Design an enzyme around this catalytic site. Structure first.
Site, mmCIF file in Angstrom:
data_model
loop_
_atom_site.group_PDB
_atom_site.id
_atom_site.type_symbol
_atom_site.label_atom_id
_atom_site.label_comp_id
_atom_site.label_asym_id
_atom_site.label_seq_id
_atom_site.Cartn_x
_atom_site.Cartn_y
_atom_site.Cartn_z
ATOM 1 N N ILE A 85 101.686 44.028 61.334
ATOM 2 C CA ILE A 85 103.094 44.054 60.969
ATOM 3 C C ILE A 85 103.875 43.317 62.038
ATOM 4 C CG2 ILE A 85 105.072 45.509 60.460
ATOM 5 C CD1 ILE A 85 102.957 47.734 59.873
ATOM 6 N N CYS A 86 104.373 42.138 61.693
ATOM 7 C CA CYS A 86 105.159 41.340 62.628
ATOM 8 C C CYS A 86 106.561 41.933 62.664
ATOM 9 C CB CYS A 86 105.166 39.875 62.213
ATOM 10 S SG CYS A 86 105.962 38.784 63.405
ATOM 11 N N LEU A 87 106.731 42.998 63.442
ATOM 12 C CA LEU A 87 107.994 43.712 63.517
ATOM 13 C C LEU A 87 108.421 43.788 64.973
ATOM 14 C CD1 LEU A 87 110.125 45.117 61.861
ATOM 15 C CD2 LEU A 87 108.888 47.263 62.121
ATOM 16 N N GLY B 76 106.009 36.524 65.925
ATOM 17 C CA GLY B 76 104.857 37.391 66.070
ATOM 18 C C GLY B 76 105.192 38.710 66.738
#
Lengths: 148, 76, 802, 76, 77
Positions: A85-87, B76
């Site tokens: 999860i690119c959070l 990212g």
């Protein structure tokens, strides 16, 4: 000392106040590997889908953000085939004051708005920045494939 | 409108605003001194985000309220 | 001309006077322009492959140069031949066919057709049958090398113009061929390895006079060679050691100085070391995989029946060209090894390296008296000047040759007494980080030292252990360097552990065999304490997840494997899952083994409060994976391949408890690690060691059962404190720990109460407040004595019923 | 008078010059047939770095001598 | 500044860069000293593959950093 009572307290308050379209809990009697469960927002093609989460707290959890990944395969740009999860707040925007419930609020919020400028998948980011009829279709398509 | 915004290392700047501005119109008087991108317009106001695409008329900034500009390291 | 080549021993007196005819007439250069191009004409077209196979033919041609090169009035003017130098627009593969010097340098046994001549007749000859093929050619190769060196030396000593010309001749060859170091070079577009290796040898043999073992001619080579721009070696794009371009371009401008053939010939040799053999050694190493990829291509096609007349002849001829292509590569891999095993040539090369190593330490020496007096041992600004501006192929060139050639048992490095000059240099690099700022260069240096310190098959000390013992430079500071360099290599990131795998071998071997380092150790633990703790904390911290990654990939190996138990990119990742688990299963053992030896002798180092909470956590969580279902249900095929031997690893892990077992703090630590504590864990480990017979003593178990019983009576008394403190007021809880604050300090920014130790671990990670994102330091705090008095009061209230 | 200029890549060029010419004008002639900018160019005679405002007769340069051009090292 | 590129053969090259320079501009340098066209040159930094439209003003400011060179080849089986 360092780890356990912080985790058990956040577990207890979700047992006090369960989230509405979400739910989370430990995988059995292993405190350091949980399982979350969400439903998609109604203003999304992610609606109708239910998603499960692979959760691993680290041994320095209250001071390191956890390692959490999805289980269900989803047509989403900020989610890979690994469910990573690119959070933002899963990284250097972490605060130790953050609760996992509030973390789970951010997760469907990413499912709500889908910030494309961190393209964890390159192809879906190009589709989302070009054709909403292609993006919103395949998300409900793979919902009927996976998230039923 | 004299409102305040402060950086990481202690630096704060002074500028003007309007009650009918937007959060990027806050940012429109942020790159006029530093030269920063509106995609890096990051506001940490009491533990929550102030979202950029909204207006100023939702985020309860009062007279000489202090904001918090950290640069973003997104990706990212 | 043709019969002159055929019968060169009969014309050698008859044509000698005709050469002498033009010397006294001064018309000498005229027929020299007629012979050697026609000689180049006769070798190129009348013979299709002027090679080393035609034992009649090339032996004639070598003598033809020997007829000329003796004459001092001719060798002073030999360079003026039509086609002596190359074209400006010349293709780099076309040196050795359109040059007067071209073909005769390319006489080498490592040519393909020679390997077809001398290997392809049988592919599975024995190890004894292998060697006789080599010395048939290797002794013949020395005839080729030594006769060329007689030619080129008289070219150098011919005139002042001519020794300039050969430097100019070589520089145009090396600069066209920087692509030999690439990963997949255009081999049909570059110079052949036989052309490059031969020239590499000749400059080494020029170095032999002023690279003597007395080292008094070392000042003939100018250490100031690079301050001035290079007229021959193209430094454009060549990466410097500890300088960028703009400072170096200023450093040409600053200090604004004559050329000298001594210094010219020396640095050119390292270029042909790096861009010559250094690509050739990488060329051979891939043929283990180039053959392996080629056999699987043919194996798929041989199951296909061929009927369709247009497509049957295609698939039939598809294999037959790959037959010769398999005949090509298998011939060449067998060819290059004996060239690398011909130790009589391989000695001079490593003799050049340590002599050049003696040169480099002289440069780093501020007095430049290194070869006589021993050197006395931010980073760019404090770097010595000449050194920091040198390129990187003066270090990368030797260390690529050193890492590669130690795979041979016929190692010229082995039993060479001149070896220690290199390790003096290698220690000096890793001692001061001002010299090289690049860590990936320093990784191949520390990878080399482990290869020199591996115990052999007979468990003999490695071939640098005598050098590690008897070198007064190294024994003072090798220990402090390796412990420092273990820290730095932090700077996903799956190579940072490959270097730590190389360090931990060297740390283990020096702790065994050299007792002075062990004495130096311990003194570094007792009197260099803040340094050594960072080494302990670093090696501890990695091991918390090394075992987790080994559990992650070895299942994922099966998950790729069972997918083929039903495309190649998963098989490409199968090697990626292999080595990364191999490094996981490897380094975790090497890390754990170092805890075994250190706790045995310095346990008082490990019982600091900053480690004892950390260490007991790492031991217990690593314990449960081994004894539990996770490693047990993980059934790995051939566990000695990955060295996943947790039965072997357990004996170390239990011993760490037993070594630390005489410390009440370590006993108090393990009982407070409720993330992974249980009495049953060690009890499981009993019968697991009860399976491996003789692996653990009964007393070894009995000491361990003594430990677990003392641990268990502790934690029951610990929860006895927990039961007398149930319902608790919320204000007495640490709002990030949710426990009772021992030392409640007030945050200045968000005005909240927190323990000293709580925010200390926060401030050891970030100097910002966690509650309102304000800047925050340890000096900013304010201790709340007032609240702790109520903490004193309220804890005594439950004591009133306790 | 003509002179010979040699490169690190080994290119050999001719150049009609005069003994009183400034060296940047000589480097302009190098840029005239090869386009290489004069701040980038760097010429060597007799193993010495040159200077722009000087002449050939200052550096005692006889006709048909050999010059050496170093392209001063460009960045990334 | 200058940064590091590490290939999968254990080779390490360095490259001086500007933060204004694009990922394409980075690929064109590595093109010359590796003989590989930039279409085949896939890059990884911190797990995330970079974008051809981006620059070195976009991903994680620090000098002495290190990329990885994943070699996607044009052809498969």
């Amino acid at each position: 000392m360092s780890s356990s009572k912080r985790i058990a307290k956040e577990l207890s308050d979700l047992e006090r106040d369960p989230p509405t379209s979400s739910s989370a809990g430990p995988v059995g009697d292993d405190l350091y590997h949980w399982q979350a469960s969400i439903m998609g927002p109604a203003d999304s093609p992610y609606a109708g889908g239910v998603f499960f989460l692979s959760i691993h707290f680290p041994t320095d959890y209250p001071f390191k953000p956890p390692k959490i990944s999805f289980t269900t395969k989803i047509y989403h740009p900020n989610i890979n085939a690994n469910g990573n999860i690119c959070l933002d707040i899963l990284k250097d925007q972490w605060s130790p004051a953050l609760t996992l419930s509030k973390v789970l609020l951010s997760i469907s919020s990413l499912l709500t708005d889908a910030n494309p400028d961190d393209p964890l998948v390159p192809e879906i980011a190009h589709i989302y920045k070009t054709d909403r009829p292609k993006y919103e279709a395949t998300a409900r398509e793979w919902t009927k494939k996976y998230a039923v | 409108m004299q409102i305040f915004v402060k950086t990481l290392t202690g630096k704060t700047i002074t500028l003007e605003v309007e009650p009918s501005d937007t959060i990027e119109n806050v940012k429109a008087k942020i790159q006029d001194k530093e030269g920063i991108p509106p995609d890096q317009q990051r506001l940490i106001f009491a533990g929550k985000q102030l979202e950029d695409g909204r207006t100023l008329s939702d985020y309860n900034i009062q007279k000489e309220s202090t904001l918090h500009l950290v640069l973003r390291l997104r990706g990212g | 001309i043709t019969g002159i080549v055929s019968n060169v021993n009969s014309y050698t007196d008859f044509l000698s006077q005709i050469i002498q005819r033009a010397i006294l007439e001064g018309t000498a250069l005229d027929l020299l322009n007629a012979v050697f191009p026609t000689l180049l004409e006769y070798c190129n077209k009348h013979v299709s492959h002027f090679d080393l196979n035609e034992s009649v033919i090339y032996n004639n041609v070598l003598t033809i140069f020997e007829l000329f090169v003796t004459f001092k009035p001719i060798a002073e003017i030999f360079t003026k031949i039509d086609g002596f130098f190359a074209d400006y627009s010349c293709k780099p593969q076309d040196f050795e066919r359109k040059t007067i010097l071209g073909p005769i340098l390319s006489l080498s046994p490592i040519e393909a057709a020679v390997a077809i001549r001398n290997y392809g007749d049988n592919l599975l000859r024995s190890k004894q049958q292998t060697a006789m093929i080599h010395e048939s050619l290797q002794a013949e190769h020395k005839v080729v090398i030594d006769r060329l060196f007689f030619i080129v030396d008289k070219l150098v000593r011919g005139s002042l113009n001519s020794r300039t010309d050969m430097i100019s001749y070589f520089a145009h060859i090396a600069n066209k061929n920087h692509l030999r170091r690439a990963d997949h070079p255009p081999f049909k577009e570059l110079s052949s390895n036989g052309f490059m290796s031969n020239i590499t040898l000749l400059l080494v043999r020029f170095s032999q006079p002023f690279l003597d073992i007395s080292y008094k001619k070392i000042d003939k080579i100018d250490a100031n060679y690079f301050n001035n721009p290079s007229l021959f070696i193209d430094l454009s794009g060549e990466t410097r050691l500890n300088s960028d371009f703009k400072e170096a371009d200023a450093f040409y401008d600053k200090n604004r100085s004559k050329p000298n053939f001594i210094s010219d010939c020396f640095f050119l040799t390292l270029t042909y070391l790096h861009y010559g053999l250094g690509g050739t050694l990488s060329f051979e190493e891939k043929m283990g995989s180039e053959i392996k990829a080629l056999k699987e291509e043919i194996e798929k096609v041989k199951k296909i029946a061929a009927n369709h007349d247009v497509f049957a002849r295609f698939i039939t001829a598809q294999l037959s060209k790959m037959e010769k292509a398999l005949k090509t590569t298998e011939s060449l891999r067998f060819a290059l090894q004996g060239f690398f095993a011909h130790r009589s040539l391989q000695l001079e090369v490593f003799d050049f390296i340590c002599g050049a190593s003696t040169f480099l330490i002289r440069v780093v020496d501020p007095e430049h008296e290194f070869p006589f007096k021993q050197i006395k041992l931010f980073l760019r600004a404090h770097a010595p000047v000449p050194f920091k501006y040198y390129p990187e192929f003066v270090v990368e060139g030797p260390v690529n040759y050193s890492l590669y050639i130690s795979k041979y048992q016929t190692s010229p490095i082995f039993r060479n007494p001149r070896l220690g000059s290199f390790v003096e240099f290698t220690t000096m690099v890793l001692r001061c980080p001002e010299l090289v700022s690049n860590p990936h260069l320093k990784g191949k240096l520390v990878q080399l030292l482990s290869v020199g310190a591996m115990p052999l098959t007979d468990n003999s000390p490695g071939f640098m252990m005598d050098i590690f013992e008897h070198d007064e430079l190294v024994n003072k500071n090798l220990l402090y360097a390796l412990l420092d360099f273990y820290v730095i290599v932090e700077k996903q990131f799956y190579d940072k552990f490959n270097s730590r795998y190389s360090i931990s071998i060297i740390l283990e071997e020096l702790y065994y065999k050299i007792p002075s380092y062990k004495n130096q150790l311990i003194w570094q633990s007792q009197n260099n304490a803040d340094f050594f703790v960072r080494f302990v904390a670093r090696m501890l911290n990695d091991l918390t997840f090394l075992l987790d990654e080994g559990l992650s990939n070895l299942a994922e190996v099966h998950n790729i494997q069972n997918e083929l138990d039903n495309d190649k990119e998963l098989q490409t990742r199968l090697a990626s899952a292999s080595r990364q688990a191999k490094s996981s299963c490897g380094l975790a053992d090497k890390s754990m083994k170092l805890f075994e030896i250190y706790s045995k002798d310095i346990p008082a180092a490990f019982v600091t409060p900053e480690i004892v909470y950390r260490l007991a956590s790492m031991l217990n969580y690593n314990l449960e994976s081994l004894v539990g279902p996770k490693c047990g249900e993980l059934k790995v095929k051939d566990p000695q391949s990955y060295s996943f031997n947790p039965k072997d690893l357990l004996k170390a892990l239990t011993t760490v408890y037993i070594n630390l077992s005489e410390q009440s703090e370590f006993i108090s630590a393990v009982a407070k690690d409720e993330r992974s504590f249980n009495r049953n864990l060690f009890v499981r480990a009993v019968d697991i060691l009860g399976r491996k017979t003789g692996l653990a003593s009964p007393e070894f178990i009995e000491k361990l059962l003594n430990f677990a019983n003392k641990a268990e009576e502790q934690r029951k008394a610990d929860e006895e404190e927990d039961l007398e403190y149930g319902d608790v007021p919320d204000e007495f809880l640490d709002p990030l720990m949710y426990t009772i604050m021992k030392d409640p300090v007030i945050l200045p920014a968000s005005k909240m109460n927190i323990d000293r130790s709580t925010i200390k671990a926060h401030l050891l990670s970030d100097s910002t407040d966690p509650f309102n994102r304000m800047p925050l330091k340890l000096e900013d705090v304010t201790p709340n004595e007032e609240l702790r008095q109520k903490i004193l009061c309220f804890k005594k209230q439950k004591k009133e019923e306790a």
